[model samples]
Target: MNKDEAGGNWKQFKGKVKEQWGKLTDDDMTIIEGKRDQLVGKIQERYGYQKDQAEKEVVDWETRNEYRW
Candidate 1:
């Protein structure tokens, strides 16, 4: 999924995101709070990943079977 898809109703979808990156902290989720850029930034900061790498991770997570509606 793309950013637009990942970003929709993110508050509800955050649990799935957390499941994908199980190492993410509460503070990370607080910062993300349904915002795509903040989510990516937190992932980058927490994981020491590059911007593209972080974005790819989010997209990959968004497309996971666990995230299906």
Candidate 2:
């Protein structure tokens, strides 16, 4: 999901985020609040990926999951 949809559907979507990035904690999910930059930073931190790589990961996820803004 894009920032807008994720933020708007955050609580319900937290499980999906967790499924995608199991390393992320409940608090991490809550704190990120579905912001794109925060998701990238958190994923980078947890997965040790570069910024662009994290972004691509998110993009791939959204596409595979059929998520839209």
Candidate 3:
């Protein structure tokens, strides 16, 4: 996470996000800013997963967390 990444909706959920999504590294703060597509893409990159698999997990995460984006 960089200086610019410190701002945005993510700040509010940092603890929960990091706690639940272990695959997401500190670098992800620069990529995902409440952006679902970016979150999925980041998941794919970090986990070396297929896009479908990434999207599926992201969708499930969002649903379980009651988060929108």
Candidate 4:
């Protein structure tokens, strides 16, 4: 993930976020960063949902992770 889009809290969950979540970096999601829809879609494609459960997943992940956009 590139720092240009957004940032998050986690200090070492980038690739994990990218490979599973998207191109997000847990460096500034301190206040819920990144493009919401953009990120959700990536997560969808990555997980194979490709349906309507992406939002739920995103929310659960973000909330549970405590910040990693």
Per-candidate TM-score against the hidden true structure:
0.62, 0.68, 0.69, 0.44
lDDT of 1 by residue, 1-69 (tens): 643443545555566667778667766776666566776888888788899998888777655633443
What is the lDDT ranking, best to worst? 2, 3, 1, 4
> Which lDDT tens digits does candidate 2 get at residues 1-69?
334654556766577888887888877787666566777888988878898898998777767654434
lDDT of each: 0.68, 0.73, 0.70, 0.51
- Global Cα RMSD, each model: 5.5, 3.6, 5.3, 7.3
Candidate 4 clashing pairs, residues 3+ apart or interchain: 7-28, 7-29, 8-27, 8-28, 8-29
User: lDDT tens digits, residues 1-69, model 4?
Assistant: 444443333334454455556544443233334455655666555455664687876676667564432
Which residue pairs in model 1 clash with each other?
A: none
User: What clash count goes with each model?
Assistant: 0, 0, 0, 5
| Winning model by lDDT | 2
Model 3 sits at a Cα RMSD from the real structure of 5.3
- Which prediction has the highest TM-score against the true structure? 3
Residue 61 lDDT (model 2): 70
Error of 1 at 29 (Å): 0.2
Model 1 Cα RMSD, Å? 5.5
Residue 6 alpha-carbon offset, candidate 2, angstroms = 8.8
Q: Which model, 2 or 4, shows the larger TM-score?
A: 2
